[PDB]
Amino acid sequence: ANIQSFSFKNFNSPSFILQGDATVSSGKLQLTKVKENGIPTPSSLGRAFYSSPIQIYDKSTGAVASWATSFTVKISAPSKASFADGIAFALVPVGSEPRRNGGYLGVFDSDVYNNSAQTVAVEFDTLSNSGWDPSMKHIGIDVNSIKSIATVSWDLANGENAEILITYNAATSLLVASLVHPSRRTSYILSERVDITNELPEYVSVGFSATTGLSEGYIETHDVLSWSFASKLPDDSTAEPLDLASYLVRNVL
Amino acid sequence: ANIQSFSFKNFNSPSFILQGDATVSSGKLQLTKVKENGIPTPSSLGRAFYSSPIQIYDKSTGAVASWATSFTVKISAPSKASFADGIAFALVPVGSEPRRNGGYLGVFDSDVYNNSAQTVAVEFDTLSNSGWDPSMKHIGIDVNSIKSIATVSWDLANGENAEILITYNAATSLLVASLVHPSRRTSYILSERVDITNELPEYVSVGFSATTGLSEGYIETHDVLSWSFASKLPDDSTAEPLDLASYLVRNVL
Amino acid sequence: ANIQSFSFKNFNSPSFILQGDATVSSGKLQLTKVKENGIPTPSSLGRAFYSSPIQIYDKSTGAVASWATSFTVKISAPSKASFADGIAFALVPVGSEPRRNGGYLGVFDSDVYNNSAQTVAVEFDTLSNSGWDPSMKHIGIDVNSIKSIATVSWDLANGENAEILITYNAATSLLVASLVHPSRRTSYILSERVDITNELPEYVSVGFSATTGLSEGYIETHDVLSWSFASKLPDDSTAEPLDLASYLVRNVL
Amino acid sequence: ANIQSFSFKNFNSPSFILQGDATVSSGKLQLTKVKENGIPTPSSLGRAFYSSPIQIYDKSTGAVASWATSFTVKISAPSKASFADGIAFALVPVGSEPRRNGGYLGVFDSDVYNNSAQTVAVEFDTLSNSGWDPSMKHIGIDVNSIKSIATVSWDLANGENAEILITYNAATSLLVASLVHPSRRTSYILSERVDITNELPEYVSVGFSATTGLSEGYIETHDVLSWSFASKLPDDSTAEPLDLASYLVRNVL
Numbered sequence A, B, C, D: 001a002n003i004q005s006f007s008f009k010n011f012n013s014p015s016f017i018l019q020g021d022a023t024v025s026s027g028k029l030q031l032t033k034v035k036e037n038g039i040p041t042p043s044s045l046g047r048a049f050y051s052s053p054i055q056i057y058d059k060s061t062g063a064v065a066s067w068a069t070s071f072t073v074k075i076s077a078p079s080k081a082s083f084a085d086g087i088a089f090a091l092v093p094v095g096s097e098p099r100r101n102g103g104y105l106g107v108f109d110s111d112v113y114n115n116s117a118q119t120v121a122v123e124f125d126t127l128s129n130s131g132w133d134p135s136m137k138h139i140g141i142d143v144n145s146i147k148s149i150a151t152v153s154w155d156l157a158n159g160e161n162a163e164i165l166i167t168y169n170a171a172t173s174l175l176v177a178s179l180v181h182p183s184r185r186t187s188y189i190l191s192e193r194v195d196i197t198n199e200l201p202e203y204v205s206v207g208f209s210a211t212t213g214l215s216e217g218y219i220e221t222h223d224v225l226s227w228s229f230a231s232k233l234p235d236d237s238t239a240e241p242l243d244l245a246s247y248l249v250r251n252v253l
């Protein structure tokens, strides 16, 4: 079995691939632009990936990897400003470049399924786009399109911390994402099946992608305060779910 | 820091402390009685704990441990029979003996708060007891009483597997439990704050407790198919949440 | 696969089974008797084991476990006193009681092979017993007898810390033990093949055993400052050596 | 604390940075050139590093990382051919390019200390270079020069597997390397103190470097069969040695 993992509480470093307005300051990962006084900026776009590619599966052996990630984000909107556009955890092709800004979170080009996009993302959408979004602020699983295949309402606590944990169990082909606002003792969960070998390439780059609104009053910040990732690729077809018990304590908590 | 952990996929062994009708057969952990033909039996009660005590916190240093567990249960009810009574993951005092059967799951004596019980449990209640239960089948956090301080409805898929993951983050004093029925792609989550140092002793025994109905038609089986546990106790007051990423992959998946 | 592991940097607790004069004080594990002023005492004997049994192999499946341990010991002898008798890391039968004191380290009864003793130990002998010991202080692998099947000279740095790491790789049936005196920058290693399934039972208790000399001038202390242990038992015959890289960093360093 | 780690038993992938004649074939890492019939080739040079940089320490906080690695190499020399030149595990500056071939293993330029080389390597020298080498084949710790600051004789078992484990404990500033030839039951160890913050930059690239002889009869192969790595960087000056117990079992064994 092949294993790769990491856990960063502090951010300074070449261990990441930054694109767009993504930057590292005060040890935290700032995905979108921010003025000197600290207020967010419109029409922004930033992405950030681990410098080492991860193997999601192996065509030759039939092995599919089980992985898991957890990170803490802090989304803040200025006093009287509205939220937009959101942040997404994504698995993209290795050389990949940003895509459509605004409501496309910098990861997709359309709301129609396009297998060739080879991108899967878990989004935390803070602005409802009438063309494809549900009426509320939600969490959703996007498979090669900006139109999620499953969503759940989400009550975004402005400025408060968010603890996210996403996992993919190869044994059941299930992708589960959960969110918790410790401050409010509120918690959300969502799960759906995904045939990962069909949607993504053998190797992918894992990281984040965020965007702000295209207008003056639709802005917010996207700070990643910490990030953990673990992936395990077996040798035979026989998949083996990960050990989240040992993972969270050895990594998150 | 002190760390203890384990992960069992197969069950034969002296590594566990069995009480009541709990037994190990075919490598799986059977908490309640079952006839030879396999049908469950009424008025049953079984408990099972890891033979090694775990330190939840240290009074001298002010350190509080962050821990996490995950296990797969399979609850089945005979053809025309009703469900009852349920299974619970519990943290009990080291020498502890079973308690009230039936709707008390063998862990509590009353539905009134009694700090001296020194027991905290996450229950998966399959029968609503009019005296203290919500109208549905639920998941709940019980703190020194059989009356949960928080619950969530749960649609028990008869005979299908259930994947549970419970975590306690000392940093936020938050207890979160989630359940997933892979077969149905359904998932539940529940979170509440718990002041662990006040409800439990410094050392506890971790394991399961289950019971069947007191009548002929209220029966079900309680099979634990696998179990993982990880606990981390720091040296100073400064708590440190676990790494669930590395935990799940190194333990569950 | 089944996995058990732990790592203690502080010692207070019921997580251990103490025998003889073994005691826990100031958070360190003191295997032998010490008067109040701190000087060691003659004819002493103490043992200490993890309260949870470990499965070394499974007769039914043919699986043999690969394990590893690391601990820091501090052996001190009073001013003008000689060293004796030594400390040993041992794998003994679950219910086992101490054995011969003095030069038998409390784990063996004779210097003749006796398969029924079902005991394997890595010893750090500080006194040469003319009947079976080499001329100098050594490290040795004892298999069902006090007469090691392999040894290596060892220059015991009085009062200085000793970092020991022992591993058993089921794939090559090799037992390797190494010692390092950071203070002097000295290091020792020893390796030999052991057919574990033939020398020990399916379940064993892991821990330490130490003894002091039977005379007034042959004394020393045996303090364990920290201890880590990890064991992995596969499902099929196919053995899988452990990951010492991830083990040491997540446990020792 | 920041943590990075990986464990590869199979080699196909972009996760590595190959230089020179390094190549990946049949899933194993071949550091030097080999003709089609499989025989080694003279004047060869290949290097290979993990695509993600690792932080050895942080100037701002005073934190120094404790790390550990383990890998299995197979060195083979054609029938009547002599051995040369050797393989080395190295920590080099991020953008670094190969250096002198032959007896310089592709990592150093001279046998005189040159702090500006910013390179530390553990070498497994298979040919004694009269200018700076000891008389026999050895294992050595090289700090900014090809002239080791410490060495140990080594009996290279031709064609047999070699299991290497290297660790650096920030707490004691000690670098320890050990080698084991399972086939012969032989084992070697070497330890010395290294002030890592003074010899290397904050960020380095970890991997291997190997070379063959410059003549027709001084050739051998350099196959890496597996590789594990784990690094942990604390937040304050207070260093914390890794857990090799949990590392080896979760990674090597």
Ligand SMILES: CC(=O)N[C@@H]1[C@@H](O)[C@@H](O)[C@@H](CO)O[C@@H]1O
Binding pocket: A084, A085, A101, A102, A103, A104, A127, A129, A212, A213, A214, A215, A218
């Ligand atoms: C498709 C698209 O980018 N739509 C954007 C939307 O995402 C949001 O940024 C909004 C702010 O006023 O501006 C547009 O409507």
Ligand SMILES: CC(=O)N[C@@H]1[C@@H](O)[C@@H](O)[C@@H](CO)O[C@@H]1O
Binding pocket: B084, B085, B101, B102, B103, B104, B127, B129, B212, B213, B214, B215, B218
């Ligand atoms: C308090 C109590 O044990 N109540 C039980 C309930 O838990 C359930 O077992 C039922 C079955 O008919 O019998 C009783 O009502």
Ligand SMILES: CC(=O)N[C@@H]1[C@@H](O)[C@@H](O)[C@@H](CO)O[C@@H]1O
Binding pocket: C084, C085, C101, C102, C103, C104, C127, C129, C212, C213, C214, C215, C218
């Ligand atoms: C066989 C045996 O226990 N021999 C002991 C030896 O181990 C040592 O303790 C010595 C101290 O004077 O006393 C005896 O000779």
Ligand SMILES: CC(=O)N[C@@H]1[C@@H](O)[C@@H](O)[C@@H](CO)O[C@@H]1O
Binding pocket: D084, D085, D101, D102, D103, D104, D127, D129, D212, D213, D214, D215, D218
């Ligand atoms: C300094 C240097 O590279 N010396 C090399 C030596 O390392 C070895 O490769 C030999 C083979 O014949 O050729 C030269 O002497």
Ligand SMILES: [Ca+2]
Binding pocket: A085, A086, A103, A125, A126, A127, A128, A129, A133
């Ligand atoms: Ca949107």
Ligand SMILES: [Ca+2]
Binding pocket: B085, B086, B103, B125, B126, B127, B128, B129, B133
């Ligand atoms: Ca009930």
Ligand SMILES: [Ca+2]
Binding pocket: C085, C086, C103, C125, C126, C127, C128, C129, C133
């Ligand atoms: Ca002796």
Ligand SMILES: [Ca+2]
Binding pocket: D085, D086, D103, D125, D126, D127, D128, D129, D133
């Ligand atoms: Ca040389």
Ligand SMILES: [Mn+2]
Binding pocket: A123, A125, A132, A133, A134, A140, A146, A147, A148
């Ligand atoms: Mn959406």
Ligand SMILES: [Mn+2]
Binding pocket: B123, B125, B132, B133, B134, B140, B146, B147, B148
């Ligand atoms: Mn209830």
Ligand SMILES: [Mn+2]
Binding pocket: C123, C125, C133, C134, C140, C146, C147, C148
């Ligand atoms: Mn001896």
Ligand SMILES: [Mn+2]
Binding pocket: D123, D125, D133, D134, D140, D146, D147, D148
């Ligand atoms: Mn050399």
